[PDB]
Scaffold this active site. Structure first.
Site, short mmCIF file in Angstrom:
data_model
loop_
_atom_site.label_atom_id
_atom_site.label_comp_id
_atom_site.label_asym_id
_atom_site.label_seq_id
_atom_site.Cartn_x
_atom_site.Cartn_y
_atom_site.Cartn_z
N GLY A 53 0.72 -1.24 0.00
CA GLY A 53 0.00 0.00 0.00
C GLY A 53 0.75 1.29 0.00
O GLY A 53 1.88 1.35 -0.41
N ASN A 54 0.10 2.35 0.46
CA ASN A 54 0.67 3.66 0.46
C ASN A 54 0.46 4.17 1.81
O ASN A 54 -0.06 3.48 2.65
CB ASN A 54 -0.08 4.59 -0.44
N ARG A 55 0.80 5.41 2.02
CA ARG A 55 0.76 5.92 3.33
C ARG A 55 -0.24 7.05 3.49
O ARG A 55 -0.05 7.90 4.31
CB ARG A 55 2.16 6.35 3.70
N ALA A 84 -5.21 8.09 -2.91
CA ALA A 84 -3.85 7.72 -3.32
C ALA A 84 -3.90 6.30 -3.87
O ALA A 84 -3.72 5.33 -3.14
CB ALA A 84 -2.87 7.82 -2.16
#
Ligand SMILES: Nc1ccn([C@@H]2O[C@H](COP(=O)(O)OP(=O)(O)OP(=O)(O)O)[C@@H](O)[C@H]2O)c(=O)n1
Ligand SMILES: Nc1ccn([C@@H]2O[C@H](COP(=O)(O)OP(=O)(O)OP(=O)(O)O)[C@@H](O)[C@H]2O)c(=O)n1
Ligand SMILES: COc1ccc2[nH]c(C(=O)O)cc2c1
Ligand SMILES: [Ca+2]
Ligand SMILES: [Ca+2]
Lengths: 224, 209
Positions: free
Chosen positions: B26-28, B94
């Site tokens: 994933g992303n943050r 995102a």
């Protein structure tokens, strides 16, 4: 107060292996289950220190000294530091098995080119090193080491045949298999003691689950 | 209530691409920026639908139609179903750019992972409108995440993104780039004020249309 006069250290949440400042690699632990047992320990008189990984959003448990980490190595550094003070060890963290080989200092931009493939490098097994450390006499204070396991079962064998091996390979005192509960629906429960005891974990809430575990822990400290 | 009778679609937070039941990539993102706009949007009279990915434990805004997703393909399909009804799309999610070549149905028991690109949803929305599939879409907003390097400033790279992506507004993090070539600064006030400057800037466009 079955756990009065005990310094207890627990790890909780899941770790994040950075690819760059923004992307990373993770395991799906909310941390709630790990928090739940530390909270019970503080209730039963235990001196609790919580190493927590990416579990923000959750409220800090009362009476528990909190330390925050991010990567799986940051966990090892945290555990090694606080470990020789603890009487009990509880590893409810979903620790990452691997991490990216290289980390870029900046964000990696999305190309119209065949998306490359990520190479991996193995992370240190925290629970295996602690069994060794005690075994080597580096833990005069440690009376208890508790692991947590997830198994689904493969065509090699079901969920249960798989974690009798893991208990035998890692060498810890108690092992909690398939032990996270549900407050919502669709959100095998098994306690494997080191005596060969295979007490099953009742399907239920994180708290009753957390209670049975500390309940199962106390008995061991008495048998010791 | 400048946004009466406005159907508005928002994405917020991050997506998670499964590797197996347990591991993912994933992303943050927090989701905070998107939740703040949907919240501000609703205050001014909008029919708000929030497609929401991974957050920090955030609470669903109220009076907001919520849709919860996990993967980015779950998002694309979520956005496609709801898109022809909306008058505005705000793409503050995102979104993951790639996903594993293979997903295990069961846990991988203890190397290199091959990857496949995800379809760019915002680009798919910008051309879709140009091709006449969205007579209802009057405004499309992207969000840029830049760290910068030696090829350029965080700032330059995102002048490129506005032209490549082709949307009505692009908000960079605090700055805001219109399709006029307009380039505004965002005071790091509360995310509530930022979200306020943004909808104000969105509203201004619908009158210029
Ligand atoms: N597959 C994708 C990925 C991005 N997003 C949207 O595209 C915008 C651009 O964000 P950013 O990640 O900075 O752009 P990228 O094209 O992914 O640029 P980069 O090379 O930095 O990854 C965001 O609104 C995001 O919601 C999208 O809709 N489709
Ligand atoms: N690098 C690791 C991985 C896990 N563990 C501990 O070892 C136990 C095993 O958890 P699990 O992820 O379910 O098993 P794995 O060790 O990953 O083994 P496998 O890949 O075979 O499932 C857990 O208590 C975990 O906290 C650890 O501390 N060190
Ligand atoms: C990977 O195995 C898992 C998966 C999910 C989990 N959740 C929690 C929790 O602490 O709630 C622990 C945990 C472990
Ligand atoms: Ca693992
Ligand atoms: Ca991207």
């Amino acid at each position: 107060h079955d756990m009065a006069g005990v310094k207890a250290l627990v790890t909780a949440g899941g770790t994040r292996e950075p690819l760059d400042p923004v992307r990373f690699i993770g395991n799906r632990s909310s941390g709630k289950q790990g928090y739940a047992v530390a909270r019970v320990l503080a209730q039963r008189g235990a001196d609790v220190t919580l190493i927590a990984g990416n579990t923000a959003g959750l409220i800090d448990p009362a009476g528990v000294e909190m330390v925050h980490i991010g990567s799986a190595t940051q966990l090892r550094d945290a555990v090694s530091k606080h470990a020789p003070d603890a009487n009990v060890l509880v590893m409810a963290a979903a620790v990452a098995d691997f991490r990216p080989a290289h980390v870029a200092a900046a964000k990696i931009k999305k190309g119209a080119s065949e998306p490359s493939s990520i190479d991996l490098v193995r992370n240190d097994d925290v629970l295996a090193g602690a069994v060794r450390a005690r075994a080597d006499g580096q833990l005069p204070n440690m009376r208890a080491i508790v692991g947590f396991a997830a198994e689904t079962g493969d065509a090699n064998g079901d969920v249960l045949f798989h974690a009798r091996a893991k208990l035998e390979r890692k060498g810890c005192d108690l092992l909690v298999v398939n032990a996270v509960g549900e407050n919502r629906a669709f959100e095998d429960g098994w306690l494997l003691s080191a005596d060969g005891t295979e007490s099953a974990l009742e399907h239920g809430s994180k708290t009753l689950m957390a209670t049975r575990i500390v309940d199962s822990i106390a008995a061991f400290l008495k048998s010791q």
